Design a binder for these strands. Structure first.
Length: 222
RNA sequence: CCGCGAGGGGAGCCCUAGCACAGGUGCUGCAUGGCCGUCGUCAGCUCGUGCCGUGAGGUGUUGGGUUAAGUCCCGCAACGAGCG
């Protein structure tokens, strides 16, 4: 799919906290706010979506990550709706530089899941019980999505890049493509495929991902 | 053990003379083992990988909350692990 001129959504976001480099991406100031040139955003999209389509049909993986409070619930949704891995709760230092060391935690989840189904439950101390029950809890928070990662992702779809600059930093050093729903406050110089756009607005993130995930699907053929 | 005997060599055991050596609570705990006192039953000491730093190093083990406790919670470039 391709989507309209639904301007009733990401006209602009940040005050004057911007990033000079972002200049190319803005229309003007109105009431002390930078307003993003959409005619342009469209030119970006037409590229960014071109990319993902390539990925989808090529059968790759894209990790969705956005730790912002607003996008929180929407990240979960969209990745879920897609055949994708996501990072909802919090981003852990190294889900890429230190993947192998992290993947070991996954296994922990894998291995605890088991015991909370086997006979060897209550049969053994109760102090440990809770001491384990807790471990699951926490794991099934952070790694809830991270679980689907068999190996390193072919791309990272980031929501607020300047907030996740870590996750970007990582990707940037492993040569993994970076997509982002960036705005005024970001430094485009590091997003492989940007999408100039308001983001704190649930209506923004909600649209950008929808059409993005929709695209992903129609690309695979379902 | 030997040819019947007489007696002859031999094992163990004994003394004598010489020898190898036995013995020494004789020095050195700054030459040592072991075992113990002690800070201290105090809550701490550290490692792998990741990341920071030219480096020595750092982060993690920190902060805010909590505990008898590095006991647990929230948070955080870290995620774990070991001795405790």
């Amino acid at each position: 799919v391709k989507e309209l001129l639904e301007a009733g959504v990401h006209f602009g976001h940040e005050r004057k906290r911007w990033n000079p480099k972002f200049a190319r991406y803005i229309y003007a100031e109105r009431n002390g706010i930078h307003i993003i040139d959409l005619q342009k955003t469209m030119e970006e999209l037409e590229r960014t979506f071109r990319f993902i389509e390539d990925l989808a049909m090529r059968g790759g993986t894209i990790l969705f990550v956005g730790t912002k409070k607003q996008a929180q619930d929407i990240v979960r949704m969209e990745a879920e709706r897609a055949g994708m891995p996501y990072v909802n709760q919090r981003w852990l230092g190294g889900m890429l530089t230190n993947f192998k060391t992290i993947s070991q935690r996954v296994h922990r989840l894998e291995e605890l899941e088991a015991l909370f189904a086997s006979p060897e439950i209550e049969e053994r101390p109760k102090k440990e019980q809770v001491r384990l029950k807790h471990e699951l809890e926490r794991l099934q928070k952070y790694l809830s999505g991270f679980r689907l990662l068999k190996r390193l992702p072919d791309a990272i779809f980031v929501v607020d890049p300047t907030k996740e600059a870590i996750a970007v930093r990582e990707a940037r050093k492993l040569f993994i493509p970076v997509i982002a729903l960036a705005d005024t406050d970001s430094d485009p110089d590091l997003v492989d495929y940007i999408i100039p756009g308001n983001d704190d607005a649930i209506r923004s993130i909600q649209l950008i991902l929808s059409r993005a995930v929709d695209l992903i699907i129609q690309a695979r053929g379902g």
